[PDB]
Every structure is written in structure tokens, then in C-alpha cells.
Design a protein around this ligand. Structure first.
Ligand SMILES: O[C@@H]1[C@H](O)[C@@H](O)OC[C@@H]1O
Ligand SMILES: O[C@@H]1[C@H](O)[C@@H](O)OC[C@@H]1O
Ligand code: NA
Ligand code: NA
Ligand code: NA
Lengths: 420, 210
């Protein structure tokens, strides 16, 4: 049940605890940062505040001010007038409290506190330059193929999914791109404190009994159209168990002359089915790259009800760091609030949560110990418009708060896939 | 500048599909060089006679949260009745809708306006899946009000008795509407969870004749 592993390596939870237990509290009003000390006895005599303003991860201005805060007291820090950004996007302010001197318990440069705010946002009104090429639609009995130079998109007309993509002669997918509504159950989803006691009220059991894990996609609609400068694939699926429709996924795929595939997804969830763990898509990519680069919340694993410690920025990590080695394996490694994701030749853009690793959700839920996991061929990607909270108030009853359950009944997200 | 923002056209295209015409639009709303809102739409009109309106809206994060995100128009038709499947029968707003019941409601047009002595936005109904007015029917998941008074007249007239029925019927169909508040009436009182602060908003409507 630890915040650290047996060898004292931190779980992702540790950083959330560090942030919430900060001794400095912050407020922003216009350009003034208000710093409040929660120390009862000590003055901030080993603290300086770093601030940094960035536009979608690109640093535009930074500075330092020493902290001089009496215990329980306040300090106002007026920022300088900030250079206005040329391009579109969201400005973000980050502040960090840094201890410049070593202590008995910490090293020089130890960060003890941080906080983020959105500043000015400039929405993009510029139309991207009209692309030269136009994609071509090939209608066969088995497939809707789409060509644009070296690139190819294949939509299986029987499954209604994107079965394969090509760049030149290289295949891109090992498994088609499919809706996923389930996650490899967390310890909190399982909800037992004793081995023999089954709880039909636990999230995993409510999901299992409803058929979430073995619901199969049924094709309701797969159609193609030629637009002035694009090909439009429209699909509609229904996930059913014992004659009951659990979810309905309505999609449009739009591939334009620039080689961008825009995916618009609209999901219906039956109100009387237990709320789903996630509303997203997954696929196995053929590629295995060393790095994962994203614009979003990080750098560590973060979930909708455990994301306050994460900061929105540009993060670049070795792929393995995008897997959390919980001894009992489950869904892990998620990052939220993500606008851009880069892996090998692939970039996905939108507003989503993702995890990426060599382990499928199927393997994670079937393997009892982390040492028994085997890296699969390629990379499994799960991209969610929505993901349910993880809970934890206790681990033996449903503990995911109502605002973090996927109960809206109708859900909409949009992804753009391309090569960069 | 929410009240004086002007729609600047970014895109307007037509397309012919196997069974439908598809209109695509984009607008930016701007005040003094600042973009407040962007609206991207598709109107899909097919062989059945139905128009599917898909709306996605971006709202600048640094602009005050807007009071609503929807569409409006003035219909030429004046009908006696309003029939809907949604919350009712009385006026209800997102933070004042617990008393309303989901059902099939049918009221005279006048009952769809609330005669507050000092006039304001009024008569909204939430959780509406279907609205029928004369020959028109709207379907989706939205909030609406319908009356002989424009939002403009309402905000310009200080007393209810000075209002005059405009020609035809003003319809306001909202994907999203801000709470009304009321914990007190002299400081901001709409709770965070009822403020339109999600930045990106999506709703869809189907318009047809019956
Ligand atoms: O009360 C909890 C639970 O009921 C028990 O089985 O495990 C320990 C915990 O305290
Ligand atoms: O994965 C879950 C767990 O590992 C098992 O023991 O109980 C039900 C479910 O299958
Ligand atoms: Na100091
Ligand atoms: Na497992
Ligand atoms: Na008024």
C-alpha cells in the first residue's frame, strides 16, 4: 500500500502528496503572485522563487526573486511586464520554490513547492495554407483504401475499423484502431482487503457482470464520400452483451491533402450500465521508438483525480518511464490534459489522455506479477477522450468520487493523426 | 465585448455527397483585436428532409465565461402551443432544475415566458430532447426558450409592461447555459460547476418538419 516501492523508489502517488503538502500557498491576481507561508515557526530563509512563462512549452520569459516570508505571513511578488506572444496559443505561468542551500535533509537546489496558472490565451484564426495534393478513394468489396503519395489508409468494410496504415512499404499497425471502454483493473477497482471475500459492488465486478470486458463490436454503418479536398469515412458501431447495447460509437474519419486524418468520435453510454473506465481508442503500433514526447500534463503518471502535481509543459521521456511497474500490474502510466503526442513518425493532436507501453491492457489484467510481463511486438497506445478516476479513499469499496465517474451518457472527442 | 462582438467569417464551403449536401462554416467572434469565441459548424441536409447541425465552440480561457453557448433565430411563424420532451413544465435553469420532471409537456406560448417585473433572460427549459413549434421539430440534447421577445428587447426594457410582442417568435437553443445563482444578488453567486469554463464545447441538433 506504499507511496514508495520496497526498495524506496517512488510510486507516482508520492509527487501528488509532495505538492498537496506544500508549505507555501499561491494566488495570482493579474500580474501579482501572493505567497503565503504555512510554516508556524521558521522564516523562509532558504528559499527563492523561480517563475517562468511559456507558450505551449516554448519559454518566453523567466526570473528569480528571493522569498522573505514570516511564518504565517504573506509576500507579494509583482512580475515584470511580459513580452506579448506573436503566435497563437495558451500562455502558462509556472512558479517553483527552490532551496539554494543544502540542509541535513536535502541537497542544494531542492524544489519544495510549485504551482501553475493559465495567463493570456490567443485563439488561432489563421487557416492553414490550402494543400496541393488530393487524396484518392478506392472502393473494393472488402476495403475503403485511401492514397496520398507514399501514404495509404485501409478501412475494413466488415469490421468498420482502420485495419492498416502504410508509409511507403512499411506497415504501421499490428492491431486495428478500435474503441476501448475498459481498463486493466486497478487495486481500487478490484476492491478487496481479504482474498476470499468477493464484492459484487466493486467496480471490476460491476463491469464484468455487465459484459464490458467481452462486449463485441457490431457494425451498423460504414460509408465513404469524396469531398472537394478530402475523403470522409463515416462509421457507426454498437457494443452488445446478452442482447443489451452498452455503448454506441459514431465516428467520422477525414483525410485531407496535407496527410492529416481527423477523427471525430461521439459515444452513447446506456444510463443503466455501470459507468465505463474509459472512453477512448487503442491500437498496436508496429514501431518501437526510444522516446516519448508530449505537450500536456507531466512528467509523471497522472490521472483525472490525481493530476494536481503535474504541470502542463513539453515533456520528453524514454519510453520505459511511460510505464509504472506496480508489482500487481494494472492500467498505469496515463498522462492527462494532452494536446500533442509524438512517437516515432506519429503525432496525435487534440485534447486527450494517453498511455504508451509494450504491454496491452489484456496482458496487464492477465498477469499477476510485474516480473511475468513480457514486452509485446510494437507499442500499445491507448488514447482516451475520457478516463475514470482511480479512487483510493480506501481500496475495499467503490471510492471514485461522482465528479470523476463517466456518467454524462453522451461523450465527444476529436483526434488528428498525421506524420511530422 | 461579449455583447458587441462581431462574427467574422473564416470559412464557408459546400459539398455534395451520395445522399446529402454538406455545408461547412467557421466564424471568429472578436472585440478590439481579441478573439473571444470560435464557432465551427456542419449542416448536413439529406434525402429525408432533415438538417443535422453539428457545433463545436472554442472559448478563450482568459475571457469571462459566457452566459450561454447556442444558436438563435426569429421564426416567422407564430403558433398557439409549444410541445417538448424535456424538463418541465415550468422554467428551469441548470442550477435550478431539481423540481422539473422529464416528460412530454405541452403549454400555450405565453406560459413559455416568465413575466419578471424587471425583464431578463427567462423561460428556459433544460434537458430537452425534442421541441415542437408549428411545423418545426428540433431534436438533440439542449436547453431552449421560446417567446415573442428578443434577448435584445429584454435587456433594453426596464419594466415588463413596456414590452411589445415582436413579429414572429424568437427561439434560443442552447447546447449550454450558465447557472443563474442567487446565494445573494449583489456579488457573483453562480457556483464554479455551473460556469461555462470548459474552453471547448460540443453540441448537435437535428431540424426537420412534421
Ligand atoms: O477495515 C478495513 C477492511 O475491512 C479490512 O478487511 O482490512 C483492513 C481495513 O482496516
Ligand atoms: O482481474 C480481476 C481480478 O484479478 C480477479 O481476481 O477478480 C476479478 C477480475 O478478473
Ligand atoms: Na530566502
Ligand atoms: Na493484473
Ligand atoms: Na431589462
Amino acid at each position: 500500500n506504499g507511496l514508495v516501492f520496497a526498495d524506496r523508489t517512488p510510486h507516482p502517488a508520492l509527487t501528488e502528496a509532495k505538492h498537496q503538502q506544500q508549505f507555501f500557498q499561491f494566488r495570482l491576481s493579474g500580474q501579482t503572485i501572493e505567497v503565503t507561508s504555512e510554516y508556524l515557526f521558521r522564516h523562509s530563509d532558504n528559499e527563492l522563487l523561480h517563475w517562468m512563462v511559456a507558450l505551449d512549452g516554448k519559454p518566453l520569459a523567466s526570473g528569480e526573486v528571493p522569498l522573505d516570508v514570516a511564518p504565517q505571513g504573506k509576500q507579494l511578488i509583482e512580475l515584470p511586464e511580459l513580452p506579448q506572444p506573436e503566435s497563437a496559443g495558451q500562455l502558462w505561468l509556472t512558479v517553483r520554490v527552490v532551496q539554494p542551500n543544502a540542509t541535513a535533509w536535502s541537497e542544494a537546489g531542492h524544489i519544495s513547492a510549485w504551482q501553475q496558472w493559465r495567463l493570456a490565451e490567443n485563439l488561432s484564426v489563421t487557416l492553414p495554407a490550402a494543400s496541393h495534393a488530393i487524396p484518392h478513394l478506392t472502393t473494393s468489396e472488402m476495403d475503403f483504401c485511401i492514397e496520398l503519395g507514399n501514404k495509404r489508409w485501409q478501412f475494413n468494410r466488415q469490421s468498420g475499423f482502420l485495419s492498416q496504415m502504410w508509409i511507403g512499404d512499411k506497415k504501421q499497425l499490428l492491431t486495428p484502431l478500435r474503441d476501448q471502454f475498459t481498463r486493466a483493473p486497478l487495486d481500487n477497482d478490484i476492491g478487496v482487503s481479504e482474498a476470499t471475500r468477493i464484492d459484487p459492488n466493486a467496480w471490476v465486478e460491476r463491469w464484468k457482470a455487465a459484459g464490458h470486458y467481452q462486449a463485441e463490436a457490431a457494425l451498423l454503418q460504414c460509408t465513404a464520400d469524396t469531398l472537394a479536398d478530402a475523403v470522409l469515412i463515416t462509421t457507426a458501431h454498437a457494443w452488445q452483451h446478452q442482447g443489451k447495447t452498452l455503448f454506441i460509437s459514431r465516428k467520422t474519419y477525414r483525410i485531407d491533402g496535407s496527410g492529416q486524418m481527423a477523427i471525430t468520435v461521439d459515444v452513447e453510454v446506456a444510463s443503466d450500465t455501470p459507468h465505463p473506465a474509459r472512453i477512448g481508442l487503442n491500437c498496436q503500433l508496429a514501431q518501437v521508438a526510444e522516446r516519448v514526447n508530449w505537450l500536456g500534463l507531466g512528467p509523471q503518471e497522472n490521472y483525472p483525480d490525481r493530476l494536481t502535481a503535474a504541470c502542463f509543459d513539453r515533456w520528453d521521456l524514454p519510453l520505459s518511464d511511460m510505464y509504472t511497474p506496480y508489482v500487481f500490474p494494472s492500467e498505469n502510466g496515463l498522462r492527462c490534459g494532452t494536446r500533442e503526442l509524438n512517437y516515432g513518425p506519429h503525432q496525435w493532436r487534440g485534447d486527450f489522455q494517453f498511455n504508451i507501453s509494450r504491454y496491452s491492457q489484456q496482458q496487464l489484467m492477465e498477469t499477476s506479477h510485474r516480473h511475468l510481463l513480457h514486452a509485446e511486438e510494437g507499442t500499445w497506445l491507448n488514447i482516451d477522450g475520457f478516463h475514470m478516476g482511480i479512487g483510493g479513499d480506501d481500496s475495499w469499496s467503490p471510492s471514485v468520487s461522482a465528479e470523476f465517474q463517466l456518467s454524462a451518457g453522451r461523450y465527444h472527442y476529436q483526434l488528428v493523426w498525421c506524420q511530422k
